């Protein structure tokens, strides 16, 4: 098993990405990593662990302010393009980048290519729940204009991932909607509900309301890329607001000074919702191989969990199973 | 000022509705309330004797499972329909119900009627922000399938409300979107962006991302009913979920004890988070009179704030001002 990793994308790149790669190499014996980026810089951090790591030099990098299609086509020697090329030329089974989301989706689509029978890829992060089981939200902005058939394919891919990678035997697939009632939604959502109702290979549990997303309402929640993107950003801003209010309550002068016992829980609280990177990162479903967008602020542990998820996606043959299921 | 209130709709109706009405009557000297529902049941809960509370008997009620059009047409003597008829016959200036949302919107459309020039009314609640300035979100589910023209009308109505009732001189109008760039959004949203940019009567500041809604990115935030409903419900349910997740962190005897010291400020925090507290209910902009949908789980405090918001809406002539635009 070979995974190509973009060493240059991300806020803490390249150090955090390299440190996560070293953690994955130490954890999984069968794993081979191709680290793509500035070779000499990458080698500077690799002085203690270099066993199953190959370093592939990339002269250029894609910056966050550049337009994705132009950057991917023009900068053939960027770390992201060379990383995707490793997968396309069959020198890697999966790839991971913490870089620009749009650039990675462009490179995945243009270079890695779609699974046969898959119309449009979907961006799918695993989000937290109160129980800690988590759930898959797909499509959070890979495809803004969606057809009902696209959403049906999203449900199938999310079900295969939830079964093979998360080990959920019969994943509950819900359709994000304005109500729990069967006939709710706009045209796209109602047409999708009717097709989902007739889709044999999934455990379709119906419409799910947004208010219940974090309450373990479903294992897979399906939506179009625009609504999903808006939903994910709403979740992020809500998490920041509540953390801010809690920090004010736990650090206020009006409260007991002894309740300073509580200062240390602030970090734990920030961890519980803000960082869902422990779940692995946003997968681009529908491509010929696993392509994973690691969060831009990924530290070494986040990179490690993205590696662990990509490894399971490869070993459990998710792409081939998706091809068969459609 | 007279407001007709549906005493029968809502999870904690009729006790919470009657108690909220009594709180409004005690807070506002000028307020007259017509309580619509079963006279004997209402009189059981009436702890007050006040000439400014009148009881209007309604033989039937529209249940949460009833179909909106069919129930509204069939149940002519329901509390919701009689409440709306009070507004239509000019025996009340506004009405409030915590009952079935689809039924209430249908009654508003059928009985109260739309302002001339408005194709579709919108469901518009006021949400809190970090600064305390607040912002108006619309449409949050009156019409799930919207055209660009409908969103333009939502921007005009929201701006009028923000200026006249909320005292914002030049309301900043943002289009809820996935990016700041002009070409962002799905087909409906980018088309709306171009029309909104060419719209004369508004201060359009462009696209706004959902992550900044609570940080005063805009005074008025415009979306279609499907996306707006999903956004609003995400905010409410997620605030409850995340608060529960963070509170779970403090469970150990020393941390339980430390948490109980902060218990009074966090009950205060939960109250401050409830968005039926910060404003009343979602107002239906575009009808001839104010019709307010209070949250189905409204307690007395939520009912009261719905009354206070309806009172501000009547006093500032928003229906007339929206019509002028």
Author numbering:
A (entry chain A): 1 to 326
B (entry chain B): 1 to 325
Authors' account:
The phosphate acyltransferase PlsX is one of the few proteins known to localize to RIFs in B. subtilis, which are present in a punctate pattern and stained with a high specificity with the lipid analog indocarbocyanine dye DiIC12. This enzyme catalyzes the first chemical step in phospholipid biosynthesis by converting acyl–acyl carrier protein (ACP) and phosphate into acyl phosphate and is essential in a large subset of bacteria. PlsX is an obvious peripheral membrane protein because it was over-expressed and purified as a cytosol protein10 and yet was consistently observed to associate with the membrane.
However, the product analog was not found in the solved structure, in which the asymmetric unit contains two largely symmetric subunits in a mushroom architecture with a four-helix bundle stem formed at the dimeric interface. The only obvious difference with the previous structure lies in a 13-residue fragment (residues 250–262) at the exposed end of the helix bundle stem. The 13-residue fragment is structurally different in the two subunits of the dimeric structure. It is comprised of a 9-residue (residues 253–261) α-helix and a 2-residue loop in chain B and a largely random coil loop in chain A. Interestingly, the 9-residue α-helical peptide in chain B is amphipathic with Thr253, Thr255, and Lys257 at the interface and Leu254, Leu258, and Ala261 forming the nonpolar surface together with the hydrophobic part of the interfacial residues. By mutating the interfacial residues of the amphipathic peptide and determining their effects on the subcellular localization, we showed that this α-peptide is indeed responsible for the RIFs localization through direct interaction with the membrane.
